[PDB]
From Swiss-Prot, chain A:
It is linked to Peroxisome biogenesis disorder complementation group 14: A peroxisomal disorder arising from a failure of protein import into the peroxisomal membrane or matrix. The peroxisome biogenesis disorders (PBD group) are genetically heterogeneous with at least 14 distinct genetic groups as concluded from complementation studies. Include disorders are: Zellweger syndrome (ZWS), neonatal adrenoleukodystrophy (NALD), infantile Refsum disease (IRD), and classical rhizomelic chondrodysplasia punctata (RCDP). It is found in: Cytoplasm; Peroxisome membrane. Belongs to the peroxin-19 family. This is Peroxisomal biogenesis factor 19. Interacts with a broad range of peroxisomal membrane proteins, including PEX3, PEX10, PEX11A, PEX11B, PEX12, PEX13, PEX14 and PEX16, PXMP2/PMP22, PXMP4/PMP24, SLC25A17/PMP34, ABCD1/ALDP, ABCD2/ALDRP, and ABCD3/PMP70. Also interacts with the tumor suppressor CDKN2A/p19ARF. Necessary for early peroxisomal biogenesis. Acts both as a cytosolic chaperone and as an import receptor for peroxisomal membrane proteins (PMPs). Binds and stabilizes newly synthesized PMPs in the cytoplasm by interacting with their hydrophobic membrane-spanning domains, and targets them to the peroxisome membrane by binding to the integral membrane protein PEX3. Excludes CDKN2A from the nucleus and prevents its interaction with MDM2, which results in active degradation of TP53.
Curated annotation (Swiss-Prot), chain B:
Component of the PEX13-PEX14 docking complex, a translocon channel that specifically mediates the import of peroxisomal cargo proteins bound to PEX5 receptor. The PEX13-PEX14 docking complex forms a large import pore which can be opened to a diameter of about 9 nm. Mechanistically, PEX5 receptor along with cargo proteins associates with the PEX14 subunit of the PEX13-PEX14 docking complex in the cytosol, leading to the insertion of the receptor into the organelle membrane with the concomitant translocation of the cargo into the peroxisome matrix. It comes from Homo sapiens. Interacts with PEX13; forming the PEX13-PEX14 docking complex. Interacts with PEX5 (via WxxxF/Y motifs). Interacts with PEX19. Interacts with tubulin. Changing F33 to A/W: Reduced interaction with PEX19, minor effect on interaction with PEX5. Belongs to the peroxin-14 family. This is Peroxisomal membrane protein PEX14. It is found in: Peroxisome membrane. Changing K37 to A/E: Reduced interaction with PEX19, minor effect on interaction with PEX5. Coiled coil: none annotated. The lineage of its organism: Eukaryota, Metazoa, Chordata, Craniata, Vertebrata.
Length: 12, 57
């Protein structure tokens, strides 16, 4: 999921 | 506001950008993205300046 790619990766 | 200019943001951003797909991701996303994540306008060019995109600033 590219959406999660913006979220998970930037979370930490 | 959440948009508090912080170096940890820059570090996380540069990692994000040059991870893999973000460099190939349109700046239409990347601009809103970093700005909404908490990076001010100054910080978003900071992260992009450090990572060295130099395209559509």
């Amino acid at each position: 999921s590219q959406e999660k790619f913006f979220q998970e990766l930037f979370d930490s | 506001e959440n948009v508090l200019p912080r170096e940890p943001l820059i570090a996380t951003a540069v990692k994000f950008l040059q991870n893999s797909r973000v460099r190939q991701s349109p700046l239409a996303t990347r601009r809103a993205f970093l700005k909404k994540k908490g990076l001010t306008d100054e910080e978003i060019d900071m992260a992009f300046q450090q990572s060295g995109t130099a395209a559509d600033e």
